[PDB]
């Protein structure tokens, strides 16, 4: 028969759709898993979707994924109450079976599921407490702690009067009665979590709003014979904006940094006023640009902007990245616009920070001295940079830092004798030629 | 203006001993509105 054929692979594919969805269920995938689950006929695979939740819960590989699982059940219970209605039934019987079996591993797997379902308003507080009364009727104390650690936050909110009575009997345990040792320190840890107010049992996937979950708080008790509907999981046979062309927000901010920068006496005062503002990290690249542009209105180098920038860098590392990004943004882009009166301010500015290790020597590796990748105003900037390196460090200490820099980009050492002839020609034109003793040995070997 | 400036105050008991550095700032001139009035030390290029 082809109708029995067509319904069976329909029953097969629905079983073969739900099982990889549950196995792929995790946080930040719940909404995408619930979407694809919704298009598969949940109501026909009513016990199929229930049994695939139960076995994926029970398997003991999970237990971690239970709050991901119970959040899907609340989504289902919000959409169709009958799915969470039947799935709460089986978990009651799965507890009562394994509690009678004394399978302590399988009980706690169900009890963590019943806890978080109560956290997600799937089930009533009545179904939780009567489990607690049965467990506390025996010892069963390893099971009941893992319940009350997770659900006691919500349960004391809802049913405080009876829940206080659960504590008071539970306090009579480790107070007037002798207990086994390893179980005992776990019970008093629950008393320790009580004073810490349950802040480590109250985190999960509250995706549904309290009015988006249709409130089917199922008031089933664990003394009810619960119909045990395994039969529907078998196969059967259905005969059935304004664009912003202006930057006036930036201009009012660019005015505020400039007024800070001119109202201060010393560089430590201007540094304190800029750090007082708590400038957001997207603007901290731009604040360095306001400082450097205001340093070029001064028409002479000042140590004010140096000790301003030094207190920026030692404050936090995001300022130090902002100066490192700006030094690349100055050399590769901004050199073409600057006049030669402004380049001697910058080369003395960046030479001051490099010579006192506020910027590393590895930032100098960006600068390359060729005929092609070198602008005539760029060579002026290198000249006023190295002079501040010579005046501060000396000609010998600068020789040591340039040797540890391995920035051949600057001084080559191999490759295109026309660049080695270029670089010796340029450095002697500055007046520092004592560094160029390495290149002259390399040059004559090529000859 | 020359006095809408945070004045460096740093530990007068130990400031006679060594150079402490600028560790704290005392307020220079107060008033409801926020001054920010520039001072001409920022407008006079120094001797060095």
């Amino acid at each position: 028969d082809e109708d029995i054929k067509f319904q069976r692979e329909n029953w097969e594919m629905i079983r073969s759709h739900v099982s990889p969805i549950i196995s792929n269920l995790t946080m930040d995938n719940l909404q995408e898993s619930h979407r694809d689950l919704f298009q598969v006929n949940i109501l026909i695979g009513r016990n199929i979707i229930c049994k695939n939740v139960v076995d994926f819960t029970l398997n003991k590989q999970n237990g971690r994924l239970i709050p991901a699982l119970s959040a899907l059940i609340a989504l289902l219970n919000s959409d169709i109450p009958d799915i969470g209605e039947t799935l709460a039934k089986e978990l009651m019987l799965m507890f009562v079976q394994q509690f009678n079996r004394k399978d302590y591993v399988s009980c706690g797997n169900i009890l963590q599921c019943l806890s978080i379902l109560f956290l997600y308003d799937v089930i009533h507080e009545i179904v939780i407490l009567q489990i607690l009364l049965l467990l506390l009727e025996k010892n069963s104390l390893r099971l009941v702690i893992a319940v009350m650690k997770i659900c006691g936050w919500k349960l004391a909110l809802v049913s405080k009067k009876t829940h206080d009575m659960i504590w008071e009997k539970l306090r009579y345990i480790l107070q007037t009665q002798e207990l086994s040792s390893t179980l005992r320190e776990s019970l008093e840890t629950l008393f320790e979590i009580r004073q810490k107010d349950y802040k480590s049992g109250s985190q999960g996937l509250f995706i549904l709003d309290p009015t988006s979950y249709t409130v089917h708080t199922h008031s089933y008790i664990v003394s009810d014979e619960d119909e045990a509907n395994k039969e529907l999981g078998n196969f059967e046979k259905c005969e059935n904006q304004i664009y912003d062309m202006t930057s006036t927000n930036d201009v009012e901010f660019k005015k505020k940094i400039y007024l800070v920068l001119k109202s201060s006496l010393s560089g430590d005062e201007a540094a304190h006023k800029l750090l007082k503002l708590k400038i957001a990290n997207n603007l901290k690249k731009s604040v360095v640009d306001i400082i450097i542009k205001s340093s070029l209105q001064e028409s002479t180098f000042s140590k004010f902007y140096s000790i301003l920038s030094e207190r920026m860098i030692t404050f936090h590392r995001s300022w130090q990245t902002a100066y490192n990004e700006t030094f690349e943004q100055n050399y590769t882009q901004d050199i073409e616009d600057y006049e030669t009166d402004q380049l001697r301010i910058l080369g003395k500015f960046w030479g001051h920070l490099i010579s006192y290790e506020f910027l590393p020597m590895d930032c100098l590796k960006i600068i390359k001295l060729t005929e092609e990748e070198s602008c005539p105003q760029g060579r002026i900037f290198i000249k006023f940079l190295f002079q501040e390196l010579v005046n501060e460090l000396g000609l010998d200490e600068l020789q040591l830092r340039l040797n540890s820099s391995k920035l051949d980009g600057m001084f080559p050492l191999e490759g295109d004798a026309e660049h080695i002839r270029y670089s010796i020609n340029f450095f002697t034109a500055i007046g520092l030629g004592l560094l160029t003793e390495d290149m002259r040995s390399r040059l004559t070997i090529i000859q | 203006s020359a006095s809408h400036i945070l004045i460096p105050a740093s530990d007068l008991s130990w400031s006679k001993q060594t150079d402490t550095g600028i560790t704290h700032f005392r307020a220079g001139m107060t008033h409801e509105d926020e001054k920010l009035i520039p001072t001409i030390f920022r407008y006079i290029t120094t001797w060095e």
């Binding site: 207190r311 404050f315 | 560790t23 704290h24 700032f25 005392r26 307020a27 107060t30």
Partner: peptide, 27 residues
């Protein structure tokens, strides 16, 4: 707190005496 810094008083000082820690001086 008056940890050795600030003024004896803000009476004859013609300031408010408001002291705030230098965020620049840390290391």
């Amino acid at each position: 707190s008056y940890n050795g810094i600030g003024l004896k008083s803000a009476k004859g000082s013609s300031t408010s005496g408001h002291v705030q820690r230098s965020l620049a001086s840390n290391n």
